[PDB]
Amino acid sequence: IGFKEYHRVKAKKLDNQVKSKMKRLQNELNKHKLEKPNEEAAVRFQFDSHG
RNA sequence: GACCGAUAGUGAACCAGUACCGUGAGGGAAAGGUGAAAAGCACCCCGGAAGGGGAGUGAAAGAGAUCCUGAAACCGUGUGCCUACAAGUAGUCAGAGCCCGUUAACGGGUGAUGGCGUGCCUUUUGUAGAAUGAACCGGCGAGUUACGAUCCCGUGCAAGGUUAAGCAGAAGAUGCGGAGCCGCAGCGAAAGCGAGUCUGAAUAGGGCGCAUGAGUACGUGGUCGUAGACCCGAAACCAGGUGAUCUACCCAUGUCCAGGGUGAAGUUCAGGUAACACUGAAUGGAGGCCCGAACCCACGCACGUUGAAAAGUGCGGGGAUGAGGUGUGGGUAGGGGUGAAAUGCCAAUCGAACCUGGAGAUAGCUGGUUCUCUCCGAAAUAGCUUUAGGGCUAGCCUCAAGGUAAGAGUCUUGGAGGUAGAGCACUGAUUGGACUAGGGGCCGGUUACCGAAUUCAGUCAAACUCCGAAUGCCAAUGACUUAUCCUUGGGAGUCAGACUGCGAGUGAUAAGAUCCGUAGUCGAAAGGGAAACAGCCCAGACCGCCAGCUAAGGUCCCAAAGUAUACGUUAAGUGGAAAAGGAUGUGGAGUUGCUUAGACAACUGGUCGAGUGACUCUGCGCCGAAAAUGUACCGGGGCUAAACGUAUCACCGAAGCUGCGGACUGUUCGAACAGUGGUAGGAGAGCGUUCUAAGGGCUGUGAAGCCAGACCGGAAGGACUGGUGGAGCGCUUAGAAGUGAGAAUGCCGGU
RNA sequence: AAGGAACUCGGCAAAAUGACCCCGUAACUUCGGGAGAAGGGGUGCUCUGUUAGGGUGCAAGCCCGAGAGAGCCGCAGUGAAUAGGCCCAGGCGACUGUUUAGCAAAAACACAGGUCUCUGCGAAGCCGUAAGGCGAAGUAUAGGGGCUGACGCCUGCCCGGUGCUGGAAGGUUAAGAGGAGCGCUUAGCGUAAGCGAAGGUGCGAAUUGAAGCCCCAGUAAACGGCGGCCGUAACUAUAACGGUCCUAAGGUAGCGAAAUUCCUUGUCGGGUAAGUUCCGACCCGCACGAAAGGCGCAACGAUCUGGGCACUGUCUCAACGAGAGACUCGGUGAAAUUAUAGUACCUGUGAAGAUGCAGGUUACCCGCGACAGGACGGAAAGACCCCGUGGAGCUUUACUGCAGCC
RNA sequence: UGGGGCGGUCGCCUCCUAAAAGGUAACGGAGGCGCCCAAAGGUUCCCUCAGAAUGGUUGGAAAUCAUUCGCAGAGUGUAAAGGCACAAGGGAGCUUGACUGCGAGACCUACAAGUCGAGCAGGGACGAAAGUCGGGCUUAGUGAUCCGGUGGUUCCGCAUGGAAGGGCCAUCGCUCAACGGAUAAAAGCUACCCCGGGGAUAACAGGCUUAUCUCCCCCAAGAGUCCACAUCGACGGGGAGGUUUGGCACCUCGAUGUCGGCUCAUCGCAUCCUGGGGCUGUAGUCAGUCCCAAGGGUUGGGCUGUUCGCCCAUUAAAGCGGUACGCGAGCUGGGUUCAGAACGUCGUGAGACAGUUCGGUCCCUAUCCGUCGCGGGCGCAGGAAAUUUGAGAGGAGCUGUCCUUAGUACGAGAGGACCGGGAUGGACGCACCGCUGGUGUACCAGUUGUUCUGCCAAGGGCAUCGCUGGGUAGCUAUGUGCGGACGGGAUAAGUGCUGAAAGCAUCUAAGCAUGAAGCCCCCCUCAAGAUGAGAUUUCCCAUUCCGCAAGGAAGUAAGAUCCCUGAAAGAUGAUCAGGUUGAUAGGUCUGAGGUGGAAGUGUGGCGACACAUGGAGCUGACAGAUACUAAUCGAUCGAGGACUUAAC
RNA sequence: GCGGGGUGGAGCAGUUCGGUAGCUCGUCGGGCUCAUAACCCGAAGGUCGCAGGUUCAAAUCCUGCCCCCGCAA
Ligand SMILES: [K+]
Ligand SMILES: [K+]
Ligand SMILES: [K+]
Ligand SMILES: [K+]
Ligand SMILES: [K+]
Ligand SMILES: [K+]
Ligand SMILES: [K+]
Ligand SMILES: [K+]
Ligand SMILES: [K+]
Ligand SMILES: [K+]
Ligand SMILES: [Mg+2]
Ligand SMILES: [Mg+2]
Ligand SMILES: [Mg+2]
Ligand SMILES: [Mg+2]
Ligand SMILES: [Mg+2]
Ligand SMILES: [Mg+2]
Ligand SMILES: [Mg+2]
Ligand SMILES: [Mg+2]
Ligand SMILES: [Mg+2]
Ligand SMILES: [Mg+2]
Ligand SMILES: [Mg+2]
Ligand SMILES: [Mg+2]
Ligand SMILES: [Mg+2]
Ligand SMILES: [Mg+2]
Ligand SMILES: [Mg+2]
Ligand SMILES: [Mg+2]
Ligand SMILES: [Mg+2]
Ligand SMILES: [Mg+2]
Ligand SMILES: [Mg+2]
Ligand SMILES: [Mg+2]
Ligand SMILES: [Mg+2]
Ligand SMILES: [Mg+2]
Ligand SMILES: [Mg+2]
Ligand SMILES: [Mg+2]
Ligand SMILES: [Mg+2]
Ligand SMILES: [Mg+2]
Ligand SMILES: [Mg+2]
Ligand SMILES: [Mg+2]
Ligand SMILES: [Mg+2]
Ligand SMILES: [Mg+2]
Ligand SMILES: [Mg+2]
Ligand SMILES: [Mg+2]
Ligand SMILES: [Mg+2]
Ligand SMILES: [Mg+2]
Ligand SMILES: [Mg+2]
Ligand SMILES: [Mg+2]
Ligand SMILES: [Mg+2]
Ligand SMILES: [Mg+2]
Ligand SMILES: [Mg+2]
Ligand SMILES: [Mg+2]
Ligand SMILES: [Mg+2]
Ligand SMILES: [Mg+2]
Ligand SMILES: [Mg+2]
Ligand SMILES: [Mg+2]
Ligand SMILES: [Mg+2]
Ligand SMILES: [Mg+2]
Ligand SMILES: [Mg+2]
Ligand SMILES: [Mg+2]
Ligand SMILES: [Mg+2]
Ligand SMILES: [Mg+2]
Ligand SMILES: [Mg+2]
Ligand SMILES: [Mg+2]
Ligand SMILES: [Mg+2]
């Protein structure tokens, strides 16, 4: 009696860890989320050589 | 004093802040009554005494010291009826026999036997429930009060109504007191304007108002707000204190450890060396050393487990000169201390001690909430919700006041719509044939090699439609019938629903499953049937009757009524449990092959001598058919009808309906008609308890209380008589409430 | 009796061992131990005997006292009571010690030893608001804190992240200093519109202004971390070797199916007739690893684990006996529980598991000694699960704060 | 929220579910939206689309033309539905009505909101005019309040004038997307845990269902040398059971204790063994499959907590299930899920498991029914003492090996029977103590320590009965004897005989047999409360009172009890042997069995000790005898026999 | 069913935000050497897994389809 409930209670604890990790990560990003630094564009043009 | 009267009122009426409980702060009871007067039972008898039986005192001793009254539980004694073949929610209805004789009544007690019948409460869709609560009896124990708001009702005055504090006065009535409050005027955010005003450019429209008018003061009642706010109940939080006489650690000063063993360093001697080293003996007496009592500890097992003991005993076990045991006196205190660290320990309490206070913390949760009858009578739904077992608005109920006839049923007529069915005209899916562009595999020419598209026929669709109902829905006009309906306001409860039939989804076209639509019953519905069986069938209990007719369902016995009538079927106890499938079971229709030119069968083409084969539909049966305590799907007996089908007629059968009698409610005009189940809940009318006022009484020639009884009223309830009791108590009208108990693992007492 | 662990989760419990003397005693070792290892033998009484010898004493005489020989008795001589069972092997902890008073004594805590770090003395650290204290009447060979835990051999790589330490300029930043300016107000100017001094007043920018942070180095017995893919050797198979990607760096020694191995009762060897346990190896380490230390390890342990011997009522399989209860009599006399009970069985029905309902079956009335199938028995308003916009303890880069510190 | 969690969802639009008005749920089936357009809006005017065939330079299936056919097969910004070809689809001219104030009246609706709207006024666009225009073919494209920003303003301005500040109108700021929005501001652990509730809600067992599971079938492609159906049974189809995995959430949260084991069983049959049969690809021995059959039986160990499973060794066999996965007020407590601790792993962490490991309190005196035993009462038409019948109930029910038949039948051999006789075991049961043993606490003996009887000798107490060696009665198994034997009756499956219906055939319809360890008996035990109270033999005898009777009372008869001595009986009652003309118990005497040579004395020895007297002495329960002691005297209870009929 | 990958021969970027297809090694050809390696000089090798859309332009954005790898299975 209560076999699966016991094991499923354990499962629910693992879920709570995921939810907490998620929530904290989201909150941390909102507090401090550096944007990716500018990737300077590269001008490219070549005077193709003639014969 | 419309305050209490010994469980009340102070905790304390009494030698009570006592007894008792706690180390302490602190907590904290129980317990009143002789008589007018002790006149408190001289004397005698039984007894060791207690306790009795007389005799005396007294109005009374059945007033004799827990001494007014003396209920119930509970415990006994005697006996009028019944009881040892009986299956019991304990009664109720019927009923002999026996025994009595009353509030004199179509009486009382008991009860062989027959019928019927699973407590009360709470909580539930649903409880006899094996869900909850109560051992029993008694007492106590829960919507109250203050101040505001609003509505109804009553009264006074009325376009007005009314005073508050305060001052005089019986703690009163009343007089004075007009400040203030509400209303008569509204509109606008406001300036402001005013029967109008605001918006707007507007004499427009529209909103809110006016014309269509009643308020106010006080009282009663309903509800609401703020207060503990109907009563009981947390785990907790915070504040101030009390604890280290237990236990943790520390500090100071004491004290305890029977006996035995092992033999460290060092030292000495002897040997040894050039010297040392080295070797052997002896001495020596180290150690969180060894073995083992006291003492301390607590490893295993048994026992104990309403214990001898709220942690022990018995048999073994570990340490036992050490980081040892223990005494005395001290220290550290809870947002703290102490911890060789277990969240362990800090007075049998520790993830935050104990006591008191804030405090009646809060509890959308559980439990409880006390007299009676009558009128009406739900909901378990929608929306929103840090919402889902809560709440709010609507729906559904009730009361009152208005409108009033505006409601409803049916018929007739009109209309909106795309479901069932059907259909392929579109969109998808799809079968066969034809015709086929191409596509691939073969040498640009072909394969029956994939094949687009076209066409012919043929299927199919919740999210296909050229079509398209039945019902249901919205209206209109009459007619016939019925009595509802709407507006405003007061009060609610309900938001867990259940099953059954039908139409669907989810599921597996399972579920007493789940979610909607629709109708019913239950919930909140007793009675009859289905053996028992909320939801199925029949049918709605105001009450009495030893009257009648019926419904579902029945009629051989249990058990009321047909062993009814007529015609067939079944042989399986089918009826009284299930499929695919199998089968010369049997009944009834129909078709067809052959047949006295002689069949089928059997006999060596003939003998023989009247039937013989196949198939379709259909009624009732058969096999397929094995579960666990015990026949075990007919309720039982039992049944060959007492089963099944068809038809007919009788009778039985409810609390349905009818007849007779009574009560009440409503409607219309004392009559008639109609109605009278009920949970949550609304409304009305009453009974009873305590106290007050005013009248009128009762009571020592016996009050209240208590105990009986066969009386009275529709209920709550009220009398009368007798016994006990020994001094208070009813009745009528009105008023005010500590006003009604069977349940709260309620509190206290008794048993 | 016979058997002897066949019992059982497990030799739990009991049995067996036990004193003194003599002989004898292994692996291993930290050279002390292990060790009472283990395994054996002896034990009574009598006579040689106030013994050989020893203590006391002036001596007599008192005590102590081995060893033998020679005999006697019994089933048996520490004749009773009291007094280790032992051996082999492994895991963990070194050890003695300490711990959940009252379900855990242990591998947990402590420990000596190791290391890191703080502290120059009014030390750091700690208690307190402060004074005043502990530290300490101490002074870096001392004191506090963290981690590890005797001893032996060792303790590898990574400073990118986080912490700590040290820097130097610079960037960012508060109060406080500064008050450019702007608004309001109004003497006055004006036909008005509007402008507007001074004063007052409401805002106020530049500039200035520390630590911290940013930045740069170091530090791992600081908190921590310690990888993927591809190819390659003349049988094959594996790769000493090579390529590339990523990282701060990719796990070294040692150990390994483990207190760690899910698959798994891995495979192999040993032990048994039979071994999911055990021991020895192997290494595809789900998910070892070097001071939350790695690997060994004598001694120690009421530690955990497996195997032998002894021994037995643990068992095959139960029997008998003793005492105390039970039972009868005399005395005394509770408790939990309890809606009232004249309180059967079967099948069924029902809130789906009935003493109580239905249909049958069975049953004369009342007890006593016994057993526990039922009364969903008693006890404790379930601790599991879910719910409540309940509580408390704890954690942190949750939110908001406070002390402390700079 | 078909427990919670994860996943998914949360507001709005379209369709289907939705049952032809509207509305209508589920974590039902499909999709879209959080915009876009300055023209893709308004108006005025004009206008048809897709596709196919044919003709044509590049040109190709498909670009552009041209003709014919061609209801929409197109398009309509953006999903779907409803519309649209007097277009809402395409093109062109001018413009901004994608206006301001509004708004009769309606739809929808709990509210808050949302939707439609003629018409009026102001000032405009297009148009010759009528007239149309308050965005788009229609239906999504959005967010309350509070609080801030901005613009306007015949509003207010706290003595007054200003101002500060506010109001009104317009407008902006929320993926407040959990979209009717808790605060401006918020994550976890609890195994150290606690409270209030719920069977409204998880689970076990129960109930319903039966997808799955187990078992059984239908069809028959086939496999099987041929041959579907000896055996096996593809592709499909139909059931039963309620042991499995599930679905549901109906009972239980003011408690229905768990897996495994132990003790004790009980039931079903889907039969593991034994019994009886059909078919066989059954020669014999063996087997295969199916039918009947539930009477009895159905092992001991190693490993593991285990169930299970593997293994070892047996057995005739090592059956499958139900009983709350039977059985914890019957036991155990090893596994698992309390508090401690540790490893691996995860986490910053408290801690946790996707894994392990060592240690960890099992309470209750039985009221009722039930079950096993034992009594008392009454009844059974007189009162007693014995012996009995059997309605009915319980018990028992198993089986191996060997010898013989017979090396026969059978077979090429190998091997090797049926049936019928006979012996002897295993397990199990009943009884009993003569035998073998156990026990034997009032028996006998040996012996240690100490204390006592004054000492010696001889003994007593205590030390587990001090210990040790024996042992009577009784009680006992492991010991012994015996049992399940012979068979009858009726049947099951099966085998048939005669025999029609249906000139044949046929076990069947009438009729007649056979045939199982099973059923009813036989065998053992209880049994007349069998209220239906039975039957037989024997004994006692009609009393005395009252009362009119019915009936009542009092002494007794036969007989029994109280009381007493006891055991062959026993918890107590009861039962049985006895109670003085009695051997009932004790004692006494004589024995048995048991122990094993007493004490005293003498002799031998220095002594411990040995020997003789002497199979001695001692001896609980056992046997026989014997009144020596106790069973005294007494008391109590116990019939006089109802009525009716029939036959005598 | 739920996720991750397919870029010259190997290992890897670039993909979100469209703009010449790349880095390291390797392969091939020619030198150097007696010859091989190293070294030096040139070149080839992917139209970004496949097939269609969108766009002036797609490895990159969209639609389908096929492989590889993890789990569950
Ligand atoms: K009183
Ligand atoms: K009461
Ligand atoms: K104190
Ligand atoms: K209800
Ligand atoms: K009187
Ligand atoms: K007694
Ligand atoms: K009954
Ligand atoms: K009951
Ligand atoms: K970690
Ligand atoms: K014997
Ligand atoms: Mg009082
Ligand atoms: Mg008086
Ligand atoms: Mg319920
Ligand atoms: Mg309850
Ligand atoms: Mg109760
Ligand atoms: Mg010591
Ligand atoms: Mg010791
Ligand atoms: Mg002491
Ligand atoms: Mg305590
Ligand atoms: Mg308060
Ligand atoms: Mg249809
Ligand atoms: Mg339902
Ligand atoms: Mg009811
Ligand atoms: Mg009625
Ligand atoms: Mg009639
Ligand atoms: Mg009748
Ligand atoms: Mg009637
Ligand atoms: Mg009626
Ligand atoms: Mg009251
Ligand atoms: Mg064993
Ligand atoms: Mg065993
Ligand atoms: Mg032991
Ligand atoms: Mg230790
Ligand atoms: Mg120790
Ligand atoms: Mg403890
Ligand atoms: Mg302990
Ligand atoms: Mg450590
Ligand atoms: Mg390191
Ligand atoms: Mg580690
Ligand atoms: Mg480390
Ligand atoms: Mg370590
Ligand atoms: Mg008793
Ligand atoms: Mg049922
Ligand atoms: Mg039942
Ligand atoms: Mg509860
Ligand atoms: Mg779910
Ligand atoms: Mg509709
Ligand atoms: Mg723990
Ligand atoms: Mg802990
Ligand atoms: Mg609780
Ligand atoms: Mg339920
Ligand atoms: Mg067949
Ligand atoms: Mg339900
Ligand atoms: Mg209960
Ligand atoms: Mg209980
Ligand atoms: Mg069978
Ligand atoms: Mg069980
Ligand atoms: Mg039980
Ligand atoms: Mg256990
Ligand atoms: Mg009972
Ligand atoms: Mg004998
Ligand atoms: Mg002597
Ligand atoms: Mg003594």
User: Distance of alpha carbon A12 from its chain centroid, rounded?
Assistant: 23
- Ligand 13 geometric centre to CA of A10 (Å): 30
End-to-end CA distance of chain A: 90
Helices vs strands, H then E, count in chain A: 1, 0
Question: Is the CB of A2 less than 7 A from some atom of nucleic acid strand C?
Answer: yes
Residues A22/A23/A25/A28 CA torsion (nearest 10 deg): 180
Determined by which method? cryo-EM
Instruction: Give residue A13's identity as a one-letter amino acid code.
Output: K
The experimental resolution of this structure, in angstroms, equals 2.9
Residues A16/A17/A19/A24 CA torsion (nearest 10 deg): 140
